[PDB]
Design a protein around this ligand. Structure first.
Ligand SMILES: OC[C@H]1O[C@H](O[C@H]2[C@H](O)[C@@H](O)[C@@H](O)O[C@@H]2CO)[C@H](O)[C@@H](O)[C@@H]1O
Ligand SMILES: OC[C@H]1O[C@H](O[C@H]2[C@H](O)[C@@H](O)[C@@H](O)O[C@@H]2CO)[C@H](O)[C@@H](O)[C@@H]1O
Ligand SMILES: OC[C@H]1O[C@H](O[C@H]2[C@H](O)[C@@H](O)[C@@H](O)O[C@@H]2CO)[C@H](O)[C@@H](O)[C@@H]1O
Ligand SMILES: [Ca+2]
Ligand SMILES: [Ca+2]
Length: 686
């Protein structure tokens, strides 16, 4: 199939995601509605169930709401069974309507539906070319109180009906008993509880294996992708071992939530996105769009900077999921604000790099503050709004104009209020003009583009006061006026003759797994695929089309590799870098080093004999290690993904800047478990 097909679970770059709070969308089946005090059919009390379910979703899919908008993927609430208690938080009653309070990951939330309803959801969606994504929140179970076991469900965890354990009397040590996090450090926010939610302990084999098996069930149920919750609150290595579990089984596009505030830029965040095996929700993008288009606390220069910086910081920028709002922020649209702000922000997002996500109700101009105010019931299914139409005209370009789906981004004109950028990929171009100034038009002269000579109509048809563009020789546009609040899209598409790789997924897996290479100009004849210098051709290439190639990872050593393709005539493509070949299936192992004292600004790191440990390359060592919570300085620890059942040699190092100090003696050694987790405790050798 082509890169654009509903069946492509590895690439969402050509899609438009619609984020839905199941409960708050559409109650298509009143029979599964909770009853009594857990339910409010008026949906006036935003903390209770309103009754929205899978059936309702199916209904809106079939009646043209979503399809008419141009939406091609839906992201829904965590489908697993949640706790049934009503929690009174100081007078107020709270239900698990949101789906973040898991009790059993192997069952469904009966208020959403049955497994059968789930299967129907998948079917109907797929039938309409819509991919399905689900939320998955393995960091915890539910709100618990260790000495008030009667509170809620004591964070009880069940394995398909079987009680595994509770927060009180956790002799198995299924959970963390370190208190609550103050969000003070990253380590602090991982090994302590989030609020009162029972923190799952991923270092417990039971827990480890359980979750890895649970996700497989959903995978087998046909999902298209996963949205991981609280990735910043779980161990990095564990998560990587989790991703490996998914990828080495049935890969699907996965993205996690790592909250970023205004003006916040985190290197931990970049590294995580670049190395864990998953991508992230683009908070950096969201926050910046809001400052510029919403709160006017930054200008075009700021947007520009975010665009260029993010492209340099994320190895795969096109995999970051963009948005203007979601369940954790107040609604972009403010009661009294000018609607054109929302419309422009939408237009901007839909035509920018990454994977756009639209929070349900945006198209309806919903307003609301933070939780739960931003989780109201969609007031209507009218296609008559301007926002609905904007989406409707733009979403589809992601599928038909690869410049939008995979192109580079380049500023062509700019001022405080205006931004003109160009997207480009192969013989395809898109040019977007945005004028945030709601009161002043702008005089656009000197605009140069890659568009061929001719006249271009605004793809928005003037909907946001866009105009026509006139390109002369050299791609120079003649002068024009960009209306106040003006937004225009111009484009050019043509066949690409040379092989051009636009995307690859998954980005990390063991030899033998099939990966998907998307782009253009591959031709219809099987060519060759290179992993570094290794050539792959023939049978291992399971499928070859002009826009997509499916190939099995050869059995090469674990490491990072560049991917390139050559058509049947031998013409080579551009390189796609950062592909990770695992050394095999992975397990999560905790490394502990005793008495490794350091000087200020000096941290301990881990290295070793396998690619997963950097192959003795200090520039690729794991760390810095932690030393506050689980173990205390001068003892250090860290959770790491490693090849299962392998005998590994390793050493620790003290790094300062790029200056490194090695542990003395000889390599420590160990053999990874075959499954489950393990803990290796050693002393630092001077
Ligand atoms: O002429 C090419 C030139 O175009 C753009 O520069 C704009 C600038 O952004 C506007 O603020 C205004 O000063 O007009 C200039 C064009 O005359 C690109 O920003 C620039 O890099 C490029 O060279
Ligand atoms: O919290 C981690 C912290 O650990 C390291 O610093 C050690 C320091 O080297 C010791 O002399 C001692 O005073 O304890 C510190 C840990 O609390 C790293 O030097 C530092 O960058 C890191 O944040
Ligand atoms: O470079 C590969 C090499 O790395 C490590 O050797 C360290 C050694 O442990 C240190 O004591 C110090 O001498 O630096 C060496 C780096 O050249 C591994 O121990 C070794 O097995 C591996 O071959
Ligand atoms: Ca219902
Ligand atoms: Ca945690």
């Amino acid at each position: 199939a082509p890169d654009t097909s509903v069946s492509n679970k590895q690439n969402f770059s050509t899609d438009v995601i619609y984020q839905i709070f199941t409960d708050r969308f559409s109650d298509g089946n009143p029979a599964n509605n909770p009853t009594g005090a857990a339910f409010d059919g008026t949906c006036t009390n935003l903390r209770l169930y309103c009754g929205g379910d899978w059936q309702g979703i199916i209904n809106k899919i079939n009646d043209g709401y979503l399809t008419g908008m141009g939406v091609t993927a839906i992201w829904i609430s965590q489908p697993v069974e949640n706790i049934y208690s009503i929690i009174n938080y100081s007078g107020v009653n709270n239900t698990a309507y949101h789906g973040y309070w898991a009790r059993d990951f192997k069952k469904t939330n009966p208020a959403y539906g049955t497994i059968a309803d789930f299967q129907n959801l998948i079917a109907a969606a797929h039938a309409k070319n819509i991919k399905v994504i689900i939320d998955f929140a393995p960091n915890h179970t539910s709100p618990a109180s260790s000495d008030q076991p009667s509170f809620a469900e004591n964070g009880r965890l069940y394995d398909n009906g079987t009680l595994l354990g509770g927060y009180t009397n956790d002799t198995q040590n299924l959970f963390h008993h370190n208190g609550g996090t103050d969000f003070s450090t990253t380590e602090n926010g991982i090994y302590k509880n989030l609020f009162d939610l029972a923190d799952l302990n991923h270092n417990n084999s039971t827990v480890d294996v359980y979750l890895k098996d649970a996700i497989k069930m959903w995978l087998d149920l046909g999902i298209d992708g996963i949205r991981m919750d609280a990735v910043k609150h779980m161990p990095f290595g564990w998560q990587k071992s989790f991703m490996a579990a998914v990828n080495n089984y049935k890969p699907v596009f996965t993205f996690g939530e790592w909250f970023l505030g205004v003006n916040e830029v985190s290197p931990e965040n970049h590294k995580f996105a670049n190395e864990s095996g998953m991508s992230l929700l683009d908070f950096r993008f969201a926050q910046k769009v809001r400052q510029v288009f919403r709160d006017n606390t930054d200008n075009m220069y700021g947007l520009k900077a975010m665009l260029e910086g993010s492209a340099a910081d994320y190895a795969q920028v096109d995999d970051q999921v963009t948005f203007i709002d979601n369940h954790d922020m107040e609604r972009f649209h403010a009661s009294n604000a000018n609607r054109r702000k929302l419309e422009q922000a939408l237009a901007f997002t839909l035509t920018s790099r990454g994977v756009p996500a639209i929070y349900y109700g945006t198209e309806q101009y919903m307003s609301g503050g933070t939780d739960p105010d931003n989780r109201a019931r969609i007031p209507s299914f009218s296609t008559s709004t301007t926002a609905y139409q904007v989406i409707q005209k733009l979403a589809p370009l992601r599928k038909c104009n690869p410049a939008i789906a995979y192109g580079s981004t380049q500023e062509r004109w700019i001022n405080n209020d205006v931004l003109i950028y160009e997207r480009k990929f192969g013989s395809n171009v898109a040019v977007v003009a945005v004028n945030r100034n709601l009161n002043a038009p702008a005089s656009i002269s000197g605009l140069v583009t890659s568009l061929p000579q001719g006249s271009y109509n605004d793809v928005l048809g003037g909907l946001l006061n866009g105009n026509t563009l006139s390109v002369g020789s050299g791609g120079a546009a003649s002068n024009f006026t960009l209306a106040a609040g003006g937004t225009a899209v111009w484009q050019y598409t043509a066949a690409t003759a040379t092989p051009t790789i636009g995307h690859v997924g998954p980005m990390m897996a063991k030899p033998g797994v099939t990966i998907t290479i998307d782009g253009r100009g591959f031709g219809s004849s099987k060519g060759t695929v290179y992993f570094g210098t290794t050539a792959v051709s023939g049978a291992d290439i399971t499928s070859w089309e002009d826009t997509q190639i499916k190939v099995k990872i050869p059995a090469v050593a674990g490491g990072n590799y560049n991917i390139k393709v050559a058509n049947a005539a031998g013409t080579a493509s551009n390189v796609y870098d950062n592909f990770e070949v695992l050394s095999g299936d992975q397990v999560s192992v905790r490394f502990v080093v005793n008495n490794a004292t350091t000087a200020l600004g000096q941290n301990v790191y881990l290295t070793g004999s396998v690619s997963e440990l950097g192959n003795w390359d200090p520039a690729k060592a794991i760390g810095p290690m932690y030393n506050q919570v689980v173990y205390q300085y001068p003892n250090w620890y860290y959770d790491v993904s490693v090849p299962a059942g392998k005998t590994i040699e390793f050493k620790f190092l003290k790094k300062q800047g790029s200056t490194v100090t090695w542990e003395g003696g000889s390599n420590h050694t160990f053999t990874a478990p075959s499954s489950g987790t393990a803990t290796i405790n050693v002393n630092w050798q001077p």
